[PDB]
């Protein structure tokens, strides 16, 4: 029934008279009912990790039980709002308290219980047979998402006995009754689910559709498939925020769940007041982005424990949205903070450490977490399809790539986007180390490419070899000089610099340089390769490249400035412009070289 506190140590609390307690069962402690999570059980006593500040607690305080694990409430209204690490709305807290801090022990419902939804029944009628995962009506949620499907929670099945009619309801109404052996079933517009148990699914699949990001280098050399995973190391100066924001903004996902585990916090306000005026035209037009997102914010200042449950909540919400058949795409902010929290809890608990003080099960935990991602087919009768594509962002301590967390992640993920520091210092803002960074979905994407752009794969390797040769010649020229350099080597170096300055630079502030469609990059890199090939052909035919380059002149400037073309002009007008530029460049090389 009740238990008394027996010992306290910062975030860990040990109670007694706790006999019926299970493991990982949720519990409320203190006179303010702080939330906890039992971890280890030893006779009467059971260790508890606390999810809030523990100051002023006194021995003898009553301890309660709930008998159910941690869970998050799904259903309509989840979206367009901001939640803390343990599923508490934040605007409601501030409004109700009229304060600026977070009052410890404050409780509010996960979803608004006052508003009403214009519900519509599905396609099932009394006397039919249903199983977990079948839709029984849609709900209007937003202009951007007209249909917010409601579902029968898994592990619940039977035959419907009574259903509600069309109309306006609050999510407390019991709109469906399921007749199993008994009539003990009622279902409102929402339900719950334990976070640590991944949602079921009919079966997984192979992802073969690129996840467009709007970044030239990312889309060109290290494509990311819609359904895979990635990793983005850094050195606290690489400015990885830019790519995260850009992909959260201009990607082609139906929904996105930004989650902040140990962030600077101010970025949350930045995104909060920045998104509300940035429109997307995926459906209809002009719909502001903020009607397409859900934020799980947990600043580094707030308690350590919540950094654990934050990512679980985010991934569970992503899975829920996927189950509706919408290709959601979650993105983390800092995985290293989660590992730090786990290490701190382990160390305080007083247990033997592992590599660099971390526990031993962190690798297994990371693998299990990452495994949840992947395209799949929903569980139900309508046979809808969805997908999830998480994008983590590790942050090492010394800025290198040898700490245990990064090594563990690289063994799990399948796309690696390393970020250099010096390139960022040079303001080459999309500073990606093109030497170590690698992708793995290259071969599979050929099925899409041949249908859409047959020549792209050969050209990417063309540029890759060009860059590799330039990097191989740089050290020799540095240690010796241009004295022992042939014309072809100088051509290679010049084109490598041209690429590094034009095809690899970007800035998400210029209107034209904020989002590069696939076709634009395709044509631009096509033009680059053609220019280099014509130069090589001419020099092979015979001419002093020092003389040839000055005559070539304006065409180099034209190819450099090609990126200035306004994206989304016609999608074919730009194609004609690229065709004309290529033709005139070829004519120039035909004559200027002569």
């Amino acid at each position: 029934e009740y238990g008394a506190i027996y010992s306290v140590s910062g975030p860990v609390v040990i109670a007694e008279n706790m006999i019926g307690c299970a493991m990982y069962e949720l519990v409320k402690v203190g006179h303010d009912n702080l939330v906890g999570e039992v971890i280890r059980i030893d006779g009467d006593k059971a260790t508890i990790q606390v999810y809030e500040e523990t100051a002023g607690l006194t021995v003898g305080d009553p301890v309660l039980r709930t008998g159910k694990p941690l869970s998050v409430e799904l259903g309509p209204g989840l979206m367009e709002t901001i939640y803390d690490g343990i599923q508490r709305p934040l605007k409601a807290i501030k409004e109700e308290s009229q304060s600026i801090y977070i009052p410890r022990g404050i409780d509010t419902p996960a979803l608004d219980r006052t508003i009403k939804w214009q519900f519509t029944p599905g396609k099932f009628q009394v006397g039919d047979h249903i199983s977990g995962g079948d839709i029984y009506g849609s709900v209007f949620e937003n202009s951007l998402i007209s249909s917010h499907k409601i579902l029968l929670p898994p592990r619940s099945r039977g035959t419907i006995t009574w259903i509600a009619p069309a109309g306006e309801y609050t999510l407390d109404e019991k709109i469906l009754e399921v007749e199993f052996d008994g009539k003990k079933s009622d279902f409102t517009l929402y339900h719950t689910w334990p976070v640590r148990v991944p949602r079921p699914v009919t079966e997984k699949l192979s992802a073969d559709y690129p996840l467009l990001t709007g970044q030239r280098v990312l889309d060109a050399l290290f494509p990311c498939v819609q359904g895979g995973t990635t990793c983005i190391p850094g050195a606290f100066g690489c400015g990885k925020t830019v790519i995260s924001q850009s992909l959260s903004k201009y990607s082609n996902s139906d929904a996105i769940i930004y989650v902040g585990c140990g962030e600077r916090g101010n970025e949350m306000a930045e995104v909060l007041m920045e998104f509300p005026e940035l429109y997307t035209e995926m459906s209809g037009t002009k719909e502001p982005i903020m009607k397409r997102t859900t934020l799980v914010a947990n600043t580094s200042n707030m308690p350590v424990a919540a950094r654990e449950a934050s990512i679980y909540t985010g991934i569970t919400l992503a899975e829920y949205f996927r189950d509706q058949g919408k290709n959601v795409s979650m993105i983390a902010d800092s995985s290293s903070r989660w590992a730090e929290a786990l290490r701190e809890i382990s160390g305080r608990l007083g247990e033997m450490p592992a590599d660099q003080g971390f526990p031993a099960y962190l690798g297994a935990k990371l693998a299990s977490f990452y495994e949840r991602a992947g395209k799949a087919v929903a569980l139900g009768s309508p046979d809808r399809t969805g997908s999830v594509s998480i994008v983590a962002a590790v942050s090492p301590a010394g800025g290198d790539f040898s700490d245990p967390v990064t090594t563990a992640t690289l063994g799990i993920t399948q796309v690696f986007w390393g970020l250099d520091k010096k390139l960022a210092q040079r303001k080459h803002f999309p500073s990606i180390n093109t030497s170590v960074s690698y992708s793995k979905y290259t071969n599979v994407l050929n099925k899409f490419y041949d249908s859409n752009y047959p020549e792209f794969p050969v050209l990417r390797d063309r540029m890759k070899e060009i860059l590799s040769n330039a990097e191989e010649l740089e050290q020799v020229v540095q240690l010796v000089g241009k004295s022992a350099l042939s014309d072809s080597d100088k051509i290679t170096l010049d084109v490598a610099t041209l690429i590094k300055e034009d095809f690899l630079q970007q800035n998400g502030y210029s209107t034209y340089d904020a989002f590069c469609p696939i076709w634009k990059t395709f044509d631009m890199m096509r033009a680059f390769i053609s220019y280099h090939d014509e130069a090589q052909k001419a020099v092979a035919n015979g001419a002093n490249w020092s003389k040839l380059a000055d005559s070539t002149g304006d065409v180099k400037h034209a190819v450099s400035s090609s990126k200035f073309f306004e994206p989304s002009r016609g999608e074919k007008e730009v194609h004609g412009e690229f065709e004309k530029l290529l033709s005139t460049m070829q004519e120039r090389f035909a004559e200027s070289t002569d």
Partner: protein
């Protein structure tokens, strides 16, 4: 003889300058890094034995 001596001395002098200004710093920084890592390992080993 003048031409040959000139080119030889130029080559050798530039090579010496390159060695002095590149190699030694590059290797000694790595030396320091390796020393730091090998000092780091023993710390956690000692912590574990103490535990």
């Amino acid at each position: 003889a003048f031409i040959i001596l000139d080119e030889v001395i130029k080559v050798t002098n530039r090579r010496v300058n390159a060695i002095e200004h590149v190699i030694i710093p590059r290797t000694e920084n790595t030396i320091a890094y390796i020393n730091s890592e090998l000092d780091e390992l023993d710390r956690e080993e000692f912590y574990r034995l103490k535990k």
